[PDB]
């Protein structure tokens, strides 16, 4: 079989460009060489610890962006905040499965694991909606607005719809 | 790469030049990523800038041909199995079923190569066997006939008097789809056992 | 350039110079499709003027085709697939049956995957023996002899004394047909069944 | 484009430089006019000038080869069918004498789709057969042996105690009958038939 | 200039692009060694920064393909042996397995022309005959059958009546005609001789 | 650009890159001339390098094997008088004489007809047979068992009570050193006779 | 036989088809596929389902195309 030295010597810097990706930028990377990069080692059954890597990256950025931005943001607006900082998560995701789909066609199903853009939406679910501080502050916060439309006053009812949306 | 209405491959070194639309016909194939131009596949080459694949050029051919007009066609000089394995990196259901036949009807026409291939032995004595020796199924070929001790007389007109052991080149199926049982079938064949 | 009267067709990416006349035949024809210039084309170059032909001439070739120069027709080695879809594509049903009759003929004459075989039961005794053995009819071949229990002579030389089990591989029909109307016959042999 | 001792040679779409003496041999080849040059060359093109040829072939090869030196070419998947049907085509003339061989071994490989066997009885004592056996002709290969009482101590160290039976293939040509004018060696077939 | 992620290898005339990953097999193999820079190398093709080394891209083929896909599948009509060559020049104790298995199965599809070929010979009463042979093993042929005295009950109907002799391509051996021997094997084989 | 200390060869007008001492292995070539860096090329391009090879590419890559490490490639595809042919022109003796035995052992089996197979009788009892067939011998086949009429120690149970007949196909060369033999060989031969 | 659930995806990639050969489109389409694809539509005897489909979609061919053409010079 083939050393793994150099393969996580470069898959360093392939997860450290993974991370630059999550964060929305392109412009400091060539694409080609993340393809090709992330591509290769699929083949030769190391994507166990791409998945890996990618589930702790994923984990790591929503941790430190999107709940942080969530539990900074007030009321009336808690719910922008959640949609847009829901919409760069989605962009990210989409942008990272761009990257990989070898994996998300032959790794995922021979493993029978879950797809990287299905596994991002779980932990997004599992620390946004079904995380305890932030789904109580999302539920009574809708009640709230829900409440307070029934009367005649003004509310934004496309993001409660949105919430609903990301809900279900 | 570079952008044009076709797409040059390097399939395993070798420059396939092929439009862009009969590469769309399965996306559940890796070939869909390589036909965009846009970043969603970047791959360039310092000689000439074509996309680089890591597919062999072997069994590319008859999968291409599947792709381009709905129909494979298996050259009878390369393995079909060969073909399978292409169909499964493709993962094209429909592919492997067609490449799956292939192999079968291979393995039941080379079903001396060791594969499948049926046998059975018939009863008669030489009143009927003359007649279903004459009446032997087409696909069933007569392998060996012989007699057996007639406590009449001394040979024929006995009932025991001759088996004729016949076989059949049989299609051997590959595993994971041919070949499995069932509950009561069990427990039928452990009842017929004794 | 392919937007005049000659053009460039990329079969195979090599550029074949042709008349749009000599493509320009019916519309059942793929060719016919790509030479004539039409809006809501994506099969074409503008880059070097030609019309792209994505199918490489390795199956372009032995498809059943009439009104130009070329060849076709299955062989004796030639893929049974491809030459089925290229009859397929010319469409009519009495094509398609045709078609599969010539296959079944160059697979049953030598009795490969129809797998048509004739077996006959010659009632032989010794001295006759070396006869029809050496006097078979050619097309035929021996498979097997087996001597026969007798109360006469000590065993050998009774009226019946062996079996010759002879055989010959061919297309009882090339076209592999059954089933007869006439009504007489089927009385007769259901007469001579008992 | 003839602009030094290279050419450009159009296939699949590739541009390539090959010298005159790879495209001369001889005066019936299709390469050799592109060496040659006059006005009404029709092979020009508007990208580099480049001669454009039909060849994205499969079997030009191996036979291409055959006439650069002119002995006929059989594989041991491609029999003296490749011969009988790319290298003529090629145009060797020595191929003419050779091809024949190459037409009558083709011959005697579709004389036995008939099978044709000569089949042969050869009675031996049991002792007698090893060394027959071992001592078999060429070409002839045994198929089958039977036992056989006698009269006289059951048949074992007797001279009728086994049948050899042995078999040899044909390599004539295909035939539907054998005539000769003589009718002396018809009075001598029937005089022998009784 | 002449070293990334990627390495460009002039394997025969042409030019490959491929990871360093990929072309390794073992940290053994000469192809890796030629992957980053070493003193010792001189000649090389600076003209596009991808290192000369001499070989046929023929048997680097089915090299690079199982180096690229992690399975080794050698075409019919190509030469395992010219594989096994390749992997050994390269020193790649992996392809040698599997050109080893590969030619163990061509060996067996190969089992006509003298290479080992198993066969074995089962015992059947005239009950259980039809059993045996209906319920023989796939991947076996069966090829003779032949009746005996019966030592026990009557004439027929024995627990050893029957003699069957089946048979397998595939030889026997670990590999080929020729496999590392033993030393326990031939006390025991002896053990068992006496 | 020609050589420098690699050398780019034009094999029939197909690019191969090797260097000049896998081609000096053997001093003796034609490719000696070639390669080497002097005036006395009759065909030759320094407009964009290598040297002028009108020759065989498709017959050049088993000749290339030999002289890069010695070893003769015999592939299914490879007409073994082609590459014979290729080597006469490469002058290597041994690789001459081991391709003509290639040709010869093909011929014997496959163009000369299937001929002069081996075959033998062995003497078995049941208690030998199953071993021997058991212990069956490389490249050998078995062909019939035959079970000998017996009224001396039964007809069962006795060391002469079955003859097992073998073959083993000669895809053999006859012997060039001289396969006709010597006086007393054939002194030996009638003295043998009886 | 007669049976709903796989006529209508079928039917109307049948019907795309046969208008993209009206839209002058067979660049991409091949005649087998459409060929098997009426031949099994039809044996299945939903005859009648092509026979107005075929009816209807030479009406539409010849106002959509034809009278476009014929009107608009």
């Not at chain 1, 941790?63 to 009336?76: C, F, G, P, Q």
């Not at chain 1, 900082?85 to 499965?97: E, K, L, P, S």
């Not at chain 2, 291939?117 to 392998?143: A, I, N, P």
Request: glycine content about 6%.
């Amino acid at each position: 079989t083939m050393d793994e030295k150099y393969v996580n010597s470069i898959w360093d810097l392939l997860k450290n460009a993974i991370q630059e990706i999550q964060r929305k930028n392109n412009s400091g990377l060539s694409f080609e060489e993340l393809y090709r990069n992330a591509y290769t080692m699929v083949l030769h059954k190391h994507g166990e610890k791409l998945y890996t890597g990618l589930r702790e990256v994923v984990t790591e950025h929503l941790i430190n962006k999107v709940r942080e931005d969530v539990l900074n943001s007030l009321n009336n607006n808690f719910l922008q905040t959640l949609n847009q900082a829901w919409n760069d998560h989605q962009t990210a995701m989409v942008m990272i499965r761009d990257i990989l789909m070898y994996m998300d066609r032959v790794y995922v199903q021979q493993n029978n694991v879950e797809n990287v853009y299905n596994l991002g939406l779980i932990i997004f679910r599992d620390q946004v909606v079904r995380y305890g501080c932030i789904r109580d502050h999302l539920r009574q916060t809708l009640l709230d607005m829900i409440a307070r439309e029934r009367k005649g006053e003004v509310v934004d009812r496309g993001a409660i719809r949105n919430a609903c949306q990301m809900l279900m | 790469g570079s952008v044009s209405k076709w797409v040059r491959l390097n399939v395993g070194g070798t420059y396939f030049l092929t439009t862009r639309q009969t590469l769309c016909r399965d996306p559940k194939s890796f070939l869909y990523r390589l036909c965009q131009a846009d970043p969603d596949l970047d791959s360039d080459k310092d000689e000439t800038g074509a996309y680089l694949i890591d597919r062999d050029p072997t069994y590319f051919g008859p999968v291409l041909n599947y792709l381009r007009h709905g129909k494979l066609v298996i050259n009878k000089d390369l393995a079909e199995e060969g073909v399978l394995e292409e169909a499964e990196f493709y993962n094209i259901t429909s592919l492997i079923k067609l490449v799956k036949d292939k192999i079968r009807e291979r393995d039941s026409k080379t079903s001396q190569v060791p594969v499948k291939h049926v046998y059975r032995v018939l009863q008669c004595q030489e009143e009927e066997l003359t007649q279903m020796v004459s009446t032997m199924s087409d696909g069933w070929k007569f392998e060996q006939l012989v007699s057996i001790g007639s406590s009449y007389n001394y040979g024929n007109e006995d009932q025991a008097e001759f088996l004729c052991v016949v076989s059949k080149e049989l299609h051997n199926t590959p595993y994971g789809t041919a070949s499995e049982p069932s509950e009561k079938a069990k427990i039928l064949q452990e009842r017929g056992s004794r």
